[PDB]
Amino acid sequence: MKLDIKKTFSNRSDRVKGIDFHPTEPWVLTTLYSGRVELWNYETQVEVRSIQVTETPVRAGKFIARKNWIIVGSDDFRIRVFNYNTGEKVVDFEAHPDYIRSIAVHPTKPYVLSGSDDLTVKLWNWENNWALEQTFEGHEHFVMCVAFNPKDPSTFASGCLDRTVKVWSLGQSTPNFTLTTGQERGVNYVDYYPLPDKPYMITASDDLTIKIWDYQTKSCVATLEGHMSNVSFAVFHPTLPIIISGSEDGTLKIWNSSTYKVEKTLNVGLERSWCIATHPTGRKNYIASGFDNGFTVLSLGNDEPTLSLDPVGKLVWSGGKNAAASDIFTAVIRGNEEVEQDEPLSLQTKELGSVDVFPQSLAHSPNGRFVTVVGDGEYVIYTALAWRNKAFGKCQDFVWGPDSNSYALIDETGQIKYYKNFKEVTSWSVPMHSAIDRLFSGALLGVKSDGFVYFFDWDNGTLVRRIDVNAKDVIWSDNGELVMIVNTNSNGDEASGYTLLFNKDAYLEAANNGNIDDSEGVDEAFDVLYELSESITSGKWVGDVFIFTTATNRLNYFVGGKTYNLAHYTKEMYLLGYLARDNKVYLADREVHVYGYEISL
Amino acid sequence: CTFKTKTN
């Protein structure tokens, strides 16, 4: 992967010991060495509420959102709850005759965990008036960190400086098992891997190392040593295949959970790294951290490769090696470039602009006027000339209409919306009752449900036809007569695609008649001209000719039932377009290096 | 030093 980190919100503050994300509200909570607690809207960069709780460091703070509470533990032996809507001290008691290090909140049950230097862990029931239900003994030193198994909240790990982790079920005075860590300086932190495909855990030590454990088989999977000083935390991101550690060396290390190699190192500049949080449900992939000098909120995306070519020859992409995933760049193509075959074109990168989301993909309007970037549930539309904004919104799919001034979406509820003039047509409705896999552009809006393909008239929305083919892609000719229906071949039983001719007349007649069969459409509007052999990875029409890439990486052309190979490349090659000026077709590889191939009989 | 002190 190529991770990308955006610095959402940073606050210089006293030593930040505890830190937690609210799950619905864009709020980070922080517990300080100063006995003060803070609530920040990291998204509008505003301090909501802040309480002077104690003179003593408060080390553990967590959200119980469901009861609209914050819960915090200090060095005065105490546990205190507050309502954050009101700032009103709900509860305040003595929970251990020693420091309180760590707190865990039960996902569902009114159950709250606290770990202590008193050697013990303890269970607390709030809707039975905070009575101490069970006291877990066994550890022979400071209990640094408690953690519920997200997959089985009846059980929980506890990381201890006595060099062990101890998993217990709610009820037994004894542990199910006890994990000697080998980490001769002790465990500061423990975290569960959230996904059901691995029973992994993780620890972090003063001994500079991080350790991944299998808790079924009870064995050390891997040692991950980076850090130059004591490792403070190590956690699994809820959503990206990463581990995140932090430490007194001042750094944050983002590790890869598969290769166990450090993907990314950050020196936030707040000195020593104390504590960690990840937005519960991956929102913006937020992770937040606490330091000697304060806290930061970081969003983590990916620099996925994007490129759209325009008809007149302009390339536009996001990201890159020397650059950021959400920076936009543009480059012009001219027959200029000496026709050397398999070397990437050299062009001059001009800065074009920026965008607020992590692209997964990017695409010009048909006429090359506008650019749409799609990502992270959001779509955005920019002017290609001075990178001016023209539209934003949420979408699971975006497809451009012929006009180059209208489009269609699958929205946050999975329902097709149609915009005309950047300003939605409310009345335009296509009632789709199955689930919508996808959306295609071209001269009829294409909609994939089941192993089917529906074709609707752009202006009204009436089903022009339904094709019973499990399409991968749908690629139209520019003059609107031809279409190629690429087939998700799925074990080469069927042909890889089908040419179809579209009679618009046959549609319009069945339109006047009111004889459009709302299940199928119009049998006469679509005729199957040919079937295709080899698999199709991408493809452009150039008149009656279909230029296409294969999974053998070969470049072919199809014209009137015949497949002629034209070149045989040796990478993953994708088609970008056909410039007539340079009589040239243009290709892109996995690294966005652009190639040019020349075409004549 | 013989004793570090996890008082932070």
Residue numbers in the entry:
A (entry chain A): 1 to 601
B (entry chain P): 1 to 8
Could you give the paper's own sentences about this structure?
COPI mediates retrograde trafficking from the Golgi to the endoplasmic reticulum (ER) and within the Golgi stack, sorting transmembrane proteins bearing C-terminal KKxx or KxKxx motifs. The heptameric COPI complex (α/β/β'/γ/δ/ε/ζ) is recruited en bloc onto Golgi membranes (Hara-Kuge et al., 1994) but can be divided conceptually into two subcomplexes. The α/β'/ε B-subcomplex has been likened to clathrin because α-COP, β'-COP, and clathrin contain N-terminal WD-repeat (also referred to as β-propeller) domains and C-terminal α-solenoid domains and because recent studies have suggested that β'-COP, like clathrin, can form trimers.
In contrast, we do not observe trimer formation of the N-terminal WD-repeat domain in any of our structures of either β'1-304 with different peptides (Supplemental Experimental Procedures) or β'1-604 with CTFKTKTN. One explanation for the poor fit is the significant conformational flexibility within β'-COP as indicated by comparing our structure of β'1-604 with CTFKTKTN with the unliganded structure. It may be that once the N-terminal WD-repeat domains are anchored to the membrane by cargo binding, flexibility between the two WD-repeat domains of β'-COP, and likely also α-COP, may facilitate assembly of polymeric coats having a range of geometries with local but no global point group symmetry. Flexibility between β'-COP WD-repeat domains and the location of cargo binding have implications for COPI coat assembly.
